[PDB]
Amino acid sequence: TXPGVTXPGV
DNA sequence: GATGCTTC
DNA sequence: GATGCTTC
């Protein structure tokens, strides 16, 4: 997730 | 070191 | 099955 904690996603 | 899901 | 790395 994020970044942080990508997206999701990417 | 945690860490985290979403679309692709 | 592949992604996507940061801020915390």
Side-chain angles (χ1 to χ4, degrees):
Chain A
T1 56
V5 36
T6 48
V10 177

